[PDB]
Every structure is written in structure tokens, then in C-alpha cells.
Amino acid sequence: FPEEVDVFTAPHWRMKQLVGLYCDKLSKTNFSNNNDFRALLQSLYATFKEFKMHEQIENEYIIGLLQQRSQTIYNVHSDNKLSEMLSLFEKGLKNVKNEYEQLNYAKQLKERLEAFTRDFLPHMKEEEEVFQPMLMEYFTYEELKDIKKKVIAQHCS
Ligand SMILES: [Fe+3]
Ligand SMILES: [Fe+3]
């Protein structure tokens, strides 16, 4: 699809970049070290807040408009359980007070992150492969242009 009407690719390039960055940070992190431990969680909190902002932009600028056009039932824009990821990081930041707890938390963190990435990648792909075509259907080219302009502006603060 022409870039000027593609509402998912550019934002997703950033989202995928972020995924790579936290996977690298995660694998390099020494969960036995308190400072290393809190820095990763801080980074993760920021990263997933950006994810949360990304999903919100889509809900407010794309999904809502699209749904008020067709009304003829769903795909829904899935949650990805971002609030639950953010809640996890918070517990690690407020509740973990020693190395035993850091290492027990780590196993759960890795589990949950892997599962998240496992839900996030198909999620983005579905937007690109299913929602985008739908947009071309229910909106004119210029209407879609206008939507993308707002979407990209929101991602560029
Ligand atoms: Fe999304
Ligand atoms: Fe997306």
C-alpha cells in the first residue's frame, strides 16, 4: 500500500525496534545485580508505556472511526495485556528486595515477556494484513490519507 495511506507500517517499525531493544537488554541483564535489575524494569516500563501509547493512538484515530463505518461485526482491536505487563514491572520495582526475590522474579519475567512478544507480533501483523485492507474498503483514499497524517503526527509526539 502507498506509504501515505499506510497507517500501520511506520509505527510498527518503531514498535519492532523496541522489541529488539528489550530482548537484547533482557539477555544481557544480570538478575543477581540489584542495579542491573532495576534498570531493566525501568527501561521495560518506558518501552511498554510507548506500546500503550501506540495502542491508544490506534483506538482513538483508527479503530473507532472504522467501527463506526461498518458496524457489521468484528475483528476487535485486541488488548495485548499491556496494563498487566506494566503492573508486573511495578511489582518488581516496589516489592523485590533481595537477590533471591530478583532471581525468582526473573524466571516469571522472562516467561511473561516471551508470551507477550508471542501475542504482540501476530497482533501487529493482523492490523497490517486485515485492518488495512478493510480501511481501503470503508474509506476513500483521501480520508485514509487524513487518518495516517494524524496517526503519524501522534507517534512523532
Ligand atoms: Fe494495535
Ligand atoms: Fe499496531
UniProtKB/Swiss-Prot annotation:
Miscellaneous comment: Binds a diiron center, that can be bridged by a hydroxo group. The hydroxo bridge is not present when FBXL5 is in the reduced form and seems to play a critical role in regulating iron binding.
This protein's record includes keyword Metal-binding: yes
Function: Component of some SCF (SKP1-cullin-F-box) protein ligase complex that plays a central role in iron homeostasis by promoting the ubiquitination and subsequent degradation of IREB2/IRP2. The C-terminal domain of FBXL5 contains a redox-sensitive [2Fe-2S] cluster that, upon oxidation, promotes binding to IRP2 to effect its oxygen-dependent degradation.
Swiss-Prot/TrEMBL domain comment: The hemerythrin-like region acts as an oxygen and iron sensor by binding oxygen through a diiron metal-center. In absence of oxygen and iron, the protein is ubiquitinated and degraded.
The entry's keywords: 2Fe-2S, Cytoplasm, Iron, Iron-sulfur, Leucine-rich repeat, Metal-binding, Nucleus, Repeat, Ubl conjugation, Ubl conjugation pathway
Binding site for Fe(3+) 1: 12, 54, 58, 127
Protein's GO biological process: intracellular iron ion homeostasis; multicellular organismal-level iron ion homeostasis; positive regulation of protein catabolic process; protein ubiquitination; SCF-dependent proteasomal ubiquitin-dependent protein catabolic process
Parent-record interval covered: 4 to 160 of 691
Name the record gives this protein: F-box/LRR-repeat protein 5
Segments for region (Hemerythrin-like): 1-156
Effect ascribed to mutating residue 58 to A: Abolishes iron-binding and promotes its degradation
Binding residue positions for Fe(3+) 2: 55, 58, 77, 123, 127
Keyword Ribosomal protein: no
Subunit structure: Part of a SCF (SKP1-cullin-F-box) protein ligase complex. Interacts with ACO1/IRP1, IREB2/IRP2; the interaction depends on the [2Fe-2S] cluster. Interacts with DCTN1/p150-glued.
Cellular component GO terms, alphabetical: cytosol; nucleus; perinuclear region of cytoplasm; SCF ubiquitin ligase complex; ubiquitin ligase complex
